[PDB]
Every structure is written in structure tokens, then in C-alpha cells.
Design an enzyme around this catalytic site. Structure first.
Site, short mmCIF file in Angstrom:
data_model
loop_
_atom_site.label_atom_id
_atom_site.label_comp_id
_atom_site.label_asym_id
_atom_site.label_seq_id
_atom_site.Cartn_x
_atom_site.Cartn_y
_atom_site.Cartn_z
N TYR A 19 -6.02 5.57 18.35
CA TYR A 19 -5.44 5.90 17.05
C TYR A 19 -5.31 7.43 16.95
O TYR A 19 -4.25 7.98 16.61
CB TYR A 19 -6.36 5.35 15.94
CG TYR A 19 -5.93 5.81 14.57
CD1 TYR A 19 -4.81 5.27 13.96
CD2 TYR A 19 -6.62 6.84 13.94
CE1 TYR A 19 -4.38 5.72 12.72
CE2 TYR A 19 -6.21 7.31 12.71
CZ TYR A 19 -5.09 6.74 12.11
OH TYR A 19 -4.75 7.19 10.86
N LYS A 24 -1.92 9.75 16.45
CA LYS A 24 -1.72 10.65 15.30
C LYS A 24 -1.51 12.09 15.78
O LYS A 24 -0.62 12.78 15.24
CB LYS A 24 -2.92 10.51 14.32
CG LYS A 24 -2.87 9.20 13.49
CD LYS A 24 -1.46 8.96 12.78
CE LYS A 24 -1.41 7.81 11.79
NZ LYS A 24 -0.11 7.71 11.06
N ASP A 29 -2.45 12.37 9.51
CA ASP A 29 -3.81 11.98 9.13
C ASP A 29 -4.58 13.29 8.96
O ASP A 29 -4.65 14.04 9.93
CB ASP A 29 -4.44 11.09 10.22
CG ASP A 29 -5.85 10.60 9.85
OD1 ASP A 29 -6.67 11.35 9.12
OD2 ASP A 29 -6.14 9.44 10.22
N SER A 35 16.26 14.48 5.82
CA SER A 35 14.94 14.83 6.29
C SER A 35 14.11 13.61 6.72
O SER A 35 14.44 12.46 6.38
CB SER A 35 14.28 15.75 5.33
OG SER A 35 13.74 15.03 4.26
N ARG A 93 0.83 -1.20 0.00
CA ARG A 93 0.00 0.00 0.00
C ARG A 93 0.87 1.26 0.00
O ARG A 93 1.72 1.45 -0.87
CB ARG A 93 -0.91 -0.07 1.24
CG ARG A 93 -1.88 -1.26 1.18
CD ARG A 93 -2.71 -1.53 2.44
NE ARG A 93 -3.30 -0.27 2.88
CZ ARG A 93 -4.46 0.29 2.44
NH1 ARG A 93 -5.27 -0.34 1.58
NH2 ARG A 93 -4.79 1.50 2.86
N1 LIG Z 1 -4.76 4.76 3.67
C1 LIG Z 1 -5.30 5.92 4.16
O1 LIG Z 1 -6.32 6.41 3.73
C2 LIG Z 1 -4.71 6.73 5.30
C3 LIG Z 1 -5.52 7.78 5.90
C4 LIG Z 1 -4.99 8.54 6.91
C5 LIG Z 1 -3.66 8.28 7.32
N2 LIG Z 1 -2.91 7.28 6.77
C6 LIG Z 1 -1.57 7.03 7.25
O2 LIG Z 1 -0.69 6.67 6.18
C7 LIG Z 1 0.29 5.67 6.54
C8 LIG Z 1 0.20 4.56 5.48
O3 LIG Z 1 -1.19 4.09 5.47
P1 LIG Z 1 -1.68 2.64 4.88
O4 LIG Z 1 -3.17 2.71 4.59
O5 LIG Z 1 -0.78 2.17 3.86
O6 LIG Z 1 -1.39 1.80 6.22
P2 LIG Z 1 -1.56 0.22 6.57
O7 LIG Z 1 -1.98 -0.48 5.35
O8 LIG Z 1 -2.60 0.11 7.66
O9 LIG Z 1 -0.18 -0.23 7.28
C9 LIG Z 1 1.13 0.28 7.25
C10 LIG Z 1 2.09 -0.84 7.59
O10 LIG Z 1 2.31 -0.62 8.97
C11 LIG Z 1 2.94 -1.72 9.53
N3 LIG Z 1 2.50 -2.01 10.93
C12 LIG Z 1 1.27 -2.09 11.50
N4 LIG Z 1 1.41 -2.46 12.82
C13 LIG Z 1 2.74 -2.65 13.06
C14 LIG Z 1 3.64 -3.05 14.20
N5 LIG Z 1 3.15 -3.36 15.39
N6 LIG Z 1 4.97 -3.07 13.98
C15 LIG Z 1 5.54 -2.77 12.75
N7 LIG Z 1 4.79 -2.37 11.68
C16 LIG Z 1 3.44 -2.34 11.80
C17 LIG Z 1 2.48 -2.95 8.73
O11 LIG Z 1 3.60 -3.77 8.21
P3 LIG Z 1 3.42 -5.36 7.81
O12 LIG Z 1 2.39 -5.35 6.69
O13 LIG Z 1 4.75 -5.80 7.31
O14 LIG Z 1 2.96 -6.11 9.06
C18 LIG Z 1 1.58 -2.29 7.69
O15 LIG Z 1 1.60 -2.96 6.44
C19 LIG Z 1 -0.12 5.21 7.93
O16 LIG Z 1 0.71 5.95 8.91
C20 LIG Z 1 -1.57 5.68 8.04
O17 LIG Z 1 -2.01 5.97 9.39
C21 LIG Z 1 -3.40 6.48 5.76
N1 LIG Z 2 -2.45 2.70 9.79
C1 LIG Z 2 -3.53 2.96 9.08
N2 LIG Z 2 -4.04 1.96 8.36
C2 LIG Z 2 -5.12 2.25 7.44
C3 LIG Z 2 -5.85 1.08 7.14
C4 LIG Z 2 -6.93 0.59 7.90
C5 LIG Z 2 -7.55 -0.61 7.49
C6 LIG Z 2 -7.10 -1.26 6.33
N3 LIG Z 2 -7.61 -2.43 5.87
O1 LIG Z 2 -8.64 -3.16 6.58
O2 LIG Z 2 -7.06 -3.10 4.70
C7 LIG Z 2 -6.04 -0.73 5.62
C8 LIG Z 2 -5.42 0.45 6.00
N4 LIG Z 2 -5.84 3.47 7.77
C9 LIG Z 2 -6.97 3.69 7.08
C10 LIG Z 2 -8.16 3.90 7.77
C11 LIG Z 2 -9.35 4.12 7.11
C12 LIG Z 2 -9.35 4.12 5.72
CL1 LIG Z 2 -10.86 4.42 4.90
C13 LIG Z 2 -8.17 3.88 5.00
CL2 LIG Z 2 -8.08 3.88 3.18
C14 LIG Z 2 -6.99 3.66 5.70
C15 LIG Z 2 -5.27 4.43 8.57
N5 LIG Z 2 -5.80 5.66 8.77
N6 LIG Z 2 -4.17 4.12 9.25
#
Ligand SMILES: NC(=O)c1ccc[n+]([C@@H]2O[C@H](COP(=O)([O-])OP(=O)(O)OC[C@H]3O[C@@H](n4cnc5c(N)ncnc54)[C@H](OP(=O)(O)O)[C@@H]3O)[C@@H](O)[C@H]2O)c1
Ligand SMILES: NC1=N[C@@H](c2ccc([N+](=O)[O-])cc2)N(c2ccc(Cl)c(Cl)c2)C(N)=N1
Ligand SMILES: NC(=O)c1ccc[n+]([C@@H]2O[C@H](COP(=O)([O-])OP(=O)(O)OC[C@H]3O[C@@H](n4cnc5c(N)ncnc54)[C@H](OP(=O)(O)O)[C@@H]3O)[C@@H](O)[C@H]2O)c1
Ligand SMILES: NC(=O)c1ccc[n+]([C@@H]2O[C@H](COP(=O)([O-])OP(=O)(O)OC[C@H]3O[C@@H](n4cnc5c(N)ncnc54)[C@H](OP(=O)(O)O)[C@@H]3O)[C@@H](O)[C@H]2O)c1
Ligand SMILES: NC(=O)c1ccc[n+]([C@@H]2O[C@H](COP(=O)([O-])OP(=O)(O)OC[C@H]3O[C@@H](n4cnc5c(N)ncnc54)[C@H](OP(=O)(O)O)[C@@H]3O)[C@@H](O)[C@H]2O)c1
Ligand SMILES: NC1=N[C@@H](c2ccc([N+](=O)[O-])cc2)N(c2ccc(Cl)c(Cl)c2)C(N)=N1
Ligand SMILES: NC1=N[C@@H](c2ccc([N+](=O)[O-])cc2)N(c2ccc(Cl)c(Cl)c2)C(N)=N1
Lengths: 248, 239, 248, 248
Positions: free
Chosen positions: C154, C158, C141, C135, C13
């Protein structure tokens, strides 16, 4: 064709550096100026010598008045008349001077609220009405929440401009127009200001104890209009070397 | 004697609740009114029955014009004429309507920026110029400034500008002992009521006034540059 | 002479898209992972096929505990052992699940506050200790002031990360280390989420009624680490399509 | 009968002034303390002197650990045991000391994040689980966006507390519990500070060039718990005499 941009107050300082950088990125530019007629035409001269027919000038006072709508309309029309299109608007022009609470007051309101906020609003309306990577960039101020003592009306204008940036981002998003801001901290310090005072400000900046170059400000504008910022709207990027984080 | 307050737009709704509550606390009040003479006078009638000569009205259009400065100086003068002092300014009057980006526009500016931000700035200057005292200004802001209503650009700009004024004025007038603060209501439509976390309802005007009362009190003597949200949690609710 | 970057949670991702785009820009990368070993190795294999010896993986749990300091020191160390330097740290790894106020709660704390806030802080300490365009970029978030119901921990992690971004910008600026954040809105919705719920979220985004791609998030990260962001520190760029401007 | 409040860290300084004013207002209070056994017991004596059976002490370390939930559960339990109810929680206790980026680091994390953030979260869960005018008041920090240099962990804890304020406001609103914060600037300077240094902080405060008295902070707490604040939740009132408005 190459895209086109309007940069307000683009004759000198930051607005010039923005116009130049957009030019170097391949934009055609409208160089707006108020009083700096010599510097405007000369800049357009340099840019046209680098590529012919890619810079024009446009004079307007952007003080608030009953004709401000027509001048803002005219700035935008100048871009479509010169280039057939208008892709980017950078609201850079700004009056800055003290308005102590304790020029008549109506003229200060007119210039500090007019140039800092009402003209950006009218320009945004005309830019939108005359319409792809369309975007508007507003030059805000990184120190809005820790203002200079006795700059109430300037501070009011810059807050209004953050409000416009958010309102317009939300309302224009359905048409694909992105609206974002860049908020400098201390950039080019007026040679107008003395050298001891200049160093006072420099000493405050965490990152390098120096003011931003105009180029550093322009770089963030360029990112925001770029294809790399396609999902960014309603965002304001601070470019202040950490200055807004320093406590009294 | 008793302290004195100016409240702008005091004839109806939230400005009325503010004027009544300040009056119950022992203020004498100027009820400022634009078009609402009957309502303003009726309210001054009610307050003066409670305590004689403690409520006057003051007419002024706070549209932005070449006369705005004179209108604002006169509102402040009204208070010093009636009461010999002016302790509190509440900047409550406000125009509210849409201004789509996509009434002439310069009329919209004069009202939505004039009333909401420029008149507050001119009143603040007059108030300060004319000065165990407890001087304060309270600006009615908007808790929804950062998630604005669609097509409310100028209004949103005016309220942001009011926040800037609140902060700039708090900093510049602090050496004079004048505090400057804000109160930002949410909704004060069942669509709206249902979105509000705290009890699915709009605030009463009186709940707005309560926060104003606090900010002018000796309980708030160290507070300046602060904006109290009174919105029942509405601004925390995502889309 | 190629710079080197650590990306935490880089196997899938958003963290994967960041690692790929850093690699494409010329960085050598440490791909940190927790559980996703196959996806991590497979990314390192692809990157190394593009350019030999330019990607390594590093496994670590980033939950808070008495060994978390040593884990974070080893992540940073792995970058110096593989590449002789470490110029960029991307704090991207993050746990996310509800913690209603009304797994033990201490495990929920360890995971949500450790990965989201404490692991970033310990990584930032190690990164700065072991030290030029240096950097750190923290993934924040954009919805942090309008939080999801029942996500208190959470949301706390953040907000703590925002504080870290600001504090570490101020304290590392004198060493020339910039620290900034990128705050996504909705990006890369989980493949498992039913299309009818994904639609609810997409509908709310003003800019295009679509979630961001991972690459759109990565683009902002690339800007912040680049020579164009040299005066930017303590800033957080929202990349949310205007979603945080939308009222309830 | 009389409502009851818990105040954490109530033996001395700001938490004491808060317990006093709550008691003056009609509340029965639990004076939580960590080390200040003499002061705690003395205060409850003064309060019970004035109205019998209206004040109890409750000792607990609020550092994060696997027993922190049980101690927080016990603080709230103590209020129900003494008074049969618990209407107000004031989260005032807080550690504060430097944690430079360049006591083990795991103990700093436990005390600075535990007391400032995790304990407030757990207290909140216990308060809510155990449930007229119910409310929680968190003591935040007006300077959280212009942090003291080298105070990363403290700053992270305070930002986390803001997130908890908002998240718990939203989640607990349907149960009629309001959650708000009060954010001091400089208040009640310690006698362990030089004349020189006290005057340094004093000179910065716009409103009177003077710190807040503890009474002035308590005044805001009183307001947020009163029936004059029934529609207020999620709000943070700065009590800083303008200090957060002053630039570098
Ligand atoms: N996707 C979104 O819409 C969204 C929205 C707001 C903020 N963000 C922020 O953007 C960043 C990337 O988001 P994402 O959706 O790609 O996140 P994600 O899919 O939830 O996860 C990021 C990676 O974090 C690692 N992780 C989780 N728990 C862990 C632990 N205990 N120790 C080590 N690693 C751990 C995992 O590695 P492994 O897979 O190898 O276990 C996971 O694949 C995150 O900081 C998220 O909060 C994302
Ligand atoms: N660390 C982190 N992970 C993701 C997240 C939550 C759930 C799933 N999922 O069930 O595949 C993936 C990413 N996450 C997140 C929460 C809500 C939405 Cl809708 C999305 Cl796209 C990502 C977030 N803000 N932080
Ligand atoms: N410089 C900094 O450190 C800094 C700090 C914070 C924010 N900013 C923001 O960054 C932007 C550029 O900064 P800067 O220092 O380059 O600003 P600047 O030199 O003060 O002025 C920009 C231009 O605005 C134009 N202008 C002024 N009054 C006008 C009027 N009534 N009508 C039309 N145009 C008018 C002037 O054009 P003519 O010369 O043709 O008259 C001037 O060249 C501004 O929006 C500023 O507020 C800058
Ligand atoms: N009510 C809410 O839910 C809410 C929400 C967010 C913010 N607010 C803020 O709270 C304040 C009070 O709100 P409200 O609903 O009571 O407002 P309101 O009913 O719209 O108006 C307040 C008063 O402002 C005066 N006013 C309007 N235009 C004027 C002009 N050109 N000159 C002089 N006076 C003028 C009117 O006085 P006359 O009647 O005498 O002509 C009016 O009665 C406003 O500042 C507002 O933006 C309220
Ligand atoms: N004073 C200011 O200018 C200022 C500025 C910003 C914010 N604040 C905030 O306002 C609140 C009160 O300020 P203050 O200056 O009165 O603070 P204070 O004098 O530092 O301390 C408050 C109390 O928290 C308790 N505490 C510390 N570590 C603890 C632990 N491990 N377990 C349990 N309790 C612990 C201590 O209780 P014992 O003494 O019983 O050990 C201490 O008395 C704090 O949340 C603070 O962060 C104050
Ligand atoms: N519009 C606008 N102009 C400039 C500015 C002020 C004074 C002089 N002489 C030149 C530019 N400006 C500014 C103010 C203070 C400082 Cl220290 C700097 Cl570097 C620029 C600003 N914030 N806005
Ligand atoms: N928990 C906490 N404690 C105090 C504080 C620090 C040290 C001493 N001695 C007393 C209070 N504190 C604080 C820090 C700096 C100053 Cl100048 C003051 Cl008055 C209080 C703070 N922000 N939070």
C-alpha cells in the site's frame, strides 16, 4: 460582526492583494506597513470607500531587536482596538537580498531572520495570547530546497518559517487555531529586475511560462482561512505553476 | 601536516565523542567550550597524552550578540593559529529547551536561534573566508524536525534554519571544494527507548560520531547538501 | 456547457462525497465503481433527480493486468460519450490491506499497485490523450512517511502516486492540464471498526481530536479543480488535522 | 567465515563497482545479471582469482510477472547455496527509458515498476524470510522530486522504492535488519552520449562540475552496510555532488 484580519507588509504587491481579497470576502483588515506609508493609507482609503470603518493601517519595523516583541504585540492590539477581535493573521512581510558567504552582518541577520521568522513567531504568540474560525497563514517559498545562490540568510529564515508553521500548527491546534502556509514560486517580478531577466524566469515555469499574479497567491490564502479548510493545519500549499519540479 | 578540525560544544556528550573519533582518525582538534572549561581541558589532556600538541581548547559564548561574529572568527582563527590549517568544521553546539507559544523571549531567540543557526552561519563564513585537500562542514541537525516536540517552537525553527544553511552553503561553497553536510540524531526515559524500532534503545554518542567521520572522509568526496539520519528508525514511527 | 468529471471509486465514503460536491458545483459526473453497483446506481439516481442527465455510472476492475489499459481508456471514453467532454479526473479508488514482509503476493501487487498507482497513470494517459480548466486530483495519503506497519505494498503504491502527481504535472502543464493531490490523514473511520479503536485514532489528531469528514476531504478537491487554483500544479494538500506532525 | 552479499544488476557500471568493493571489504558476493552474461562471468573470475570460492553469478529477469516471486526467491537461495548465509542485499538493478503520457504499455509497467520496485520488495521478503550485521541497501534516485520529463513510470518506480525503504526499515528493524538507500545524481555517464550532452549534465553539478564515479556510489553503500552504520535504518544518503539543490 465581520471577522478581522492582520496582513503584514500589506501596502504593495502580494500583501496588498491578500488584504484586498480578504476585504472583498468580508473581512475587516489591518494594513501593516514599514516604509510604504503613502501606499498603505491610500489602500486603506479605497477599502473604506467600499465599506466604512473596515480598514486601518499600523506602522512597525519588524527587524529583530529587543523591541520586536512589543511591536508585534502592538500590531495585534491594533486589530483588537480597531475591530474588537482578530480572526486571521497573514505573515507576509519579508526582507529579501543576497548575503554571500564569501549593511553589517548583524543587521542582515536582524532583518532577514527577524522579518522572515522571528516576527512571525512573536506575532503568532500575541495572536494566540489575545484569544470561531481562527487561522494563521505564513507566506513561505516554493523554492526553499533549491535555493538562490548567495541567499543563505533569506533561505534560513524561510526554512525557520516552515518550522514555525509546523510547530505552531501542532501547539495551537488544541485552541482551534489553524496554521498553514502558502509557498509562491515566482509571482510579481520586481520591475526593479530587468525585462530580459524577467523572461528568463518566466521561461522556467511549466504552467504557462508566466509568473503568478498576486491574485493567484491571494486565492490560496483565502481558501486556507475559509470554512472549506476547517480540517487543514500544518499544511503548506505551493502555488508555483510547477516551478519547484523542474530540474537544473 | 595532519588535518585539523574545529568541533563546537566539544567538551561533553556528542561533541566529545566527535572530537575523540576525529582525533583517533588522525585529526588535530580545537575543543570549543562555553562553560565547560574543566571538561574541555581534561579532554584536551587525554588527546595530547595520545599525541602531543594535537588538541587545543577555545572558549566562546555562541549566544547571538553584536560580538557573535567576532567570537566565530576567533574560533576559526584558533585552529589556524594552533595548526596552520582548518580542514573540518563540526557545528555541534546547541541549546535545547521549550518556548511555549501560549529568560526574556529575546534571550531565548539569541540562544535557540543564535547558537543553533546563526553561529553555524558565521562559523561557516569564517571557515570559507579563511581558506589534495578535503574541506568539509558537518552540521548537527535533528531527525525529528518534521514531527517536532510540543512547545519547542524556537528550537524547531533553529534546526530548520540549520537545514536551510546546510543546503545553501553546500551550493555556494561547492565551487571552492568545500562540502557541507548534516547528521541528524534521534534520541542519542524508557518511554523514548521503547519507541525506537532498531533495538528499543537510544544511539550512543559514538554512533553519531561514526556518521560525522564518514562525511569528513575521502569515502564521502562526492556528498554535499546531504543529511544523514542516525535515529534507529524513530522518525518513521507514526503517532 | 457544464464541465464533466470522472471520480473513480465514487459509490461510497470519500469518493461519493467528492462526486456529490462536484455535482453541486455544477459538474456532470461519471461515478466509477467496482463491486458497489447498488450504491453507485442509487447515487446516480439522486444526482439525476437533482438535475436530469447529469450522472452516469461506469463499472470496472482497476487491478493491474493486460486489460487494465483498455478498462482505463473506457472509463475516460464513457465520460466523453455521456457528456461530450471530460474536464476533471479524480483518482480516488484504492485497495488497502496488510502485506507483511515476514491472495497470492502477485495478486496483492496487482491490486495494491494497480489501483493505487498504475490505474491512475493509465487514466491520466487516457485523459490527456482524449483532450478549459482541465485538472487531475490524486487521493494520496498524509501518513506516507510514517507508514503503518506491514502495509509495504500500500505504502509503495501511495509513494508511486506522489511520483505520478509530480511527473504528470510537469509533462501535462504545457497542455494546460494541472495535476495535484489531496492527502487525507484519518477520515470517515470504517463504521465496522470498534468505537474503542476509532477513539485511539481520534485521540491522536491535534485539530479537534476527530477524523475528517468525507466532505472535508471533498472541499480540498473542489478547491484544486476550481478557478482559484489555476496556478497550482504538482502540489499535494494535506487534509489531516495535523496528524502527520505528531511524533511517536 | 566471510559474510555474503547479493548485488542485483552487478555485471556492469554501478552494480559492478558495488560488488567489487563489497568483495574487497571481505564479503562473498552473488553477481546477479540479466543479459550481461559475458561481463558477469568475467567479474566472478576476477574475484575468485583473488580469493577462491567467493563469487558466483545468478541470472534472472526482474520484470514483473507471475513468476517474479520465484526468481527473487531463487536469487536469495543462490546466495545460501553458495555460501551458507546472506548478510547484505543490494537492490541495484533497474530499467530506465521514456514513457511519455501523450513495447506495450503493460510491458513498460512490468519492466519499470518490476525492476525498480516490485523485485526489490520480493527480494526483501525472501531475504528476511531466509533469516549479525544484516542489511539491505536500495539504489534510489537523487532527482526523484525534480523528475526528467516523460519518465513517469521510472519516477513512480523510484518513489515506490523510497516507500519500500521506509516501510521495510520499520517492519524489519525488530529482526535486526537495517534498510537504507543510496541516491545517485549523475554518475558514470554512458559513452552512448554526445560530448555536447555530457557536458550539459556535467556543468550543472555544483561540486566539481563532474559526474560521480561508480566507486563514489559504492563508497556510500559500503558505509551503510558497515558497523559504522549500526544505528542507521530508514535513511537515504544522496550522492549527487549538490545536483538536487540546483534550481531550474
Ligand atoms: N479514509 C481515510 O482515512 C484515508 C486515509 C488516507 C488516504 N485515503 C485515500 O483516500 C481515497 C478514498 O479513501 P476511502 O477511505 O474512501 O477508500 P475506500 O473506502 O477504501 O475505497 C475506495 C473505493 O475504491 C474502489 N476499489 C478498491 N479496490 C478496487 C479495484 N480493484 N478496482 C476498482 N476499484 C476499487 C472501491 O469501489 P467499490 O466499492 O465499487 O468496489 C472502493 O469503494 C483512497 O485513495 C484512500 O487511499 C483515505
Ligand atoms: N483505499 C483506502 N481505503 C481506506 C479504508 C480501509 C479500510 C476500510 N474499512 O475496513 O471500511 C475503509 C477504508 N483507507 C483507510 C485506512 C485506514 C483508516 Cl483508519 C481509514 Cl479511515 C481509511 C486507506 N488509507 N485507503
Ligand atoms: N514575490 C515572489 O515571487 C515570491 C516568491 C517566493 C516567496 N515570496 C514570499 O511572498 C511574500 C510576499 O512576496 P512579495 O514579493 O510581495 O514581497 P516584497 O514586495 O519583497 O515585500 C513584502 C513587504 O515586506 C515588508 N518588509 C520588508 N522589510 C521589512 C521590515 N524590516 N519590517 C517590516 N516590514 C518589512 C515591506 O513593507 P514596506 O514596503 O511598508 O517597507 C514589503 O512591502 C514574502 O513573504 C515573500 O518572501 C514571494
Ligand atoms: N542528543 C540527542 O539525542 C540529540 C537529538 C536531536 C538532535 N541533537 C543535536 O546533536 C547536537 C549535540 O547534542 P547533545 O545532546 O550532545 O547536546 P548538548 O549536550 O545539549 O550541548 C552541546 C554543547 O553545546 C554547547 N552550548 C549550548 N549553549 C551554548 C552557548 N550559548 N554557547 C556556546 N556553546 C553552547 C554546550 O557547551 P558548554 O558545555 O561548553 O557550555 C554543550 O555542551 C546538538 O546540535 C543537538 O540539537 C541531539
Ligand atoms: N547512473 C546514474 O547517474 C544514476 C542516477 C540515478 C539513479 N541511478 C540508480 O543506480 C542504480 C545503478 O545505476 P546504473 O546507471 O549502473 O544503471 P544501469 O547501467 O542502467 O543498469 C543496472 C542494471 O540493472 C539490470 N536490469 C535492467 N533491466 C533488467 C531486468 N528486466 N531484469 C534484471 N535486470 C535488469 C541490467 O542488467 P544486465 O546488463 O545484466 O541486463 C543493468 O545492468 C540503478 O538502480 C539506477 O536507477 C543511477
Ligand atoms: N521578500 C521577498 N521579496 C521579493 C522581492 C525581491 C526583490 C524585489 N525587488 C521585490 C520583491 N522576493 C522575490 C525574489 C525573487 C523574485 Cl524573481 C521575485 Cl518575483 C520575488 C522574495 N522571494 N521575497
Ligand atoms: N537504471 C538507470 N539507468 C541509468 C542509465 C540510463 C541509460 C544508460 N545508457 C545507462 C544508464 N540511469 C541514468 C539516467 C540518466 C543518466 Cl545521465 C545517467 Cl548517468 C544514468 C538511471 N537513472 N537509472
Amino acid at each position: 460582526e465581520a471577522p478581522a484580519a492582520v496582513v503584514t507588509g500589506a501596502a504593495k504587491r502580494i500583501g496588498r492583494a491578500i488584504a484586498v481579497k480578504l476585504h472583498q470576502t468580508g473581512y475587516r483588515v489591518v494594513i501593516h506597513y514599514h516604509n510604504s506609508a503613502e501606499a498603505a493609507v491610500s489602500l486603506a482609503d479605497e477599502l473604506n470607500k467600499e465599506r466604512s470603518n473596515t480598514a486601518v493601517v499600523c506602522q512597525a519595523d519588524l527587524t529583530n531587536s529587543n523591541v520586536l516583541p512589543a511591536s508585534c504585540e502592538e500590531i495585534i492590539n491594533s486589530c483588537f482596538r480597531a475591530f474588537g477581535r482578530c480572526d486571521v493573521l497573514v505573515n507576509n512581510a519579508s526582507a529579501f537580498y543576497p548575503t554571500p558567504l564569501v549593511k553589517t552582518v548583524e543587521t542582515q541577520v536582524a532583518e532577514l531572520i527577524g522579518t522572515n521568522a522571528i516576527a512571525p513567531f512573536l506575532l503568532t504568540m500575541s495572536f494566540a495570547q489575545r484569544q470561531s474560525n481562527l487561522s494563521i497563514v505564513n507566506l513561505c517559498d516554493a523554492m526553499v530546497d533549491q535555493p538562490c545562490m548567495a541567499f543563505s540568510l533569506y533561505n534560513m529564515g524561510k526554512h525557520a518559517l516552515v518550522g514555525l508553521t509546523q510547530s505552531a500548527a501542532l501547539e495551537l491546534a488544541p485552541y482551534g487555531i489553524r496554521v498553514n502556509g502558502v509557498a509562491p514560486g515566482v509571482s510579481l517580478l520586481p520591475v526593479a529586475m530587468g525585462e530580459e531577466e524577467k523572461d528568463k524566469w518566466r521561461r522556467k515555469v511549466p504552467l504557462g511560462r508566466r509568473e503568478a499574479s498576486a491574485e493567484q497567491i491571494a486565492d490560496a490564502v483565502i481558501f486556507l482561512v475559509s470554512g472549506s479548510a476547517q480540517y487543514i493545519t500544518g499544511s503548506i500549499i505551493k502555488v508555483d505553476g510547477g516551478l519547484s519540479l523542474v530540474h537544473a
